[PDB]
Amino acid sequence: GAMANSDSCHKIDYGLYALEILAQYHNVSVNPEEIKHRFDTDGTGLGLTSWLLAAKSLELKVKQVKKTIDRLNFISLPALVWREDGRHFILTKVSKEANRYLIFDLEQRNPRVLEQSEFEALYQGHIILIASRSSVAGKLAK
Numbered sequence: 001g002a003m004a005n006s007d008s009c010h011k012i013d014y015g016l017y018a019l020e021i022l023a024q025y026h027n028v029s030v031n032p033e034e035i036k037h038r039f040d041t042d043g044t045g046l047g048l049t050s051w052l053l054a055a056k057s058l059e060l061k062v063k064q065v066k067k068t069i070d071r072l073n074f075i076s077l078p079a080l081v082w083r084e085d086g087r088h089f090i091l092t093k094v095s096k097e098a099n100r101y102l103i104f105d106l107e108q109r110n111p112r113v114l115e116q117s118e119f120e121a122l123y124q125g126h127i128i129l130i131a132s133r134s135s136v137a138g139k140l141a142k
Contacts, residue, residue, distance in 0.1 A: 008043065014088050014106030015046035018080050019054050021090055021104060025078060025140070026132030028060040045086055052128065061131035069094075069116070069123055076138040078104065080128040091127070092141075 001009070016032050023030030036043070038057060039050035046054055048064060055062035064082060067075055078092040081103070092111060093102035099116035114122070131138065 011043075011045075013040065013045045014083075014086060015051050016040065016054070017106045017109075018088055018090050018104075019046065019051060019058075021106070022062075022078070022080060022130045023055065023058050023060055026060055026130065026135050028058050028132055030058050030060075048082055048126075048128075051082075055130060059133065061133070061136070062128055064126060064128045066125050067127050068125065069120065070096075072101075072127065075127065076129040076131055078130075078138065080130065081123055082126050082128050083122070084124065087122070089122070 001007070013032075013036070016035055019035060020030045020032055035046065035054045035057075039054040040046050052062050052064055072079060072091055073094045073096055078090045080088060080090050082088055089106055089112075090104035091101060092104055095101070095113070101114045101116070101119040103112050103114055103119070104110070105112050129138075
């Protein structure tokens, strides 16, 4: 709206959200308001590079790299599968035995288990690996 009350609808951003989840997953601070203020200055969502820097600014380690689904089982989970369409999601586990993939839906704020055909249909090859000074292993949910 525009009447000195809302100005601009807080259009949710899966990217920023994922950052929050990952930031919170690592127990690292994250101010989406400030994040968007620093990286989403455009107000159109956190960019790949802007998002990566968003996590770094939080004293949180992150790095986008082109990996293969077969590698996601060895990458730093939970990992963030960057989606050029903005419909990203956080990979937390992969059931190669069943070809399924456990991801965190940034829309519903809940985990989900996709099928290879599904994950493959969504995966692009570029994933963002996150790490924290205190958590540089990823496997926090032993």
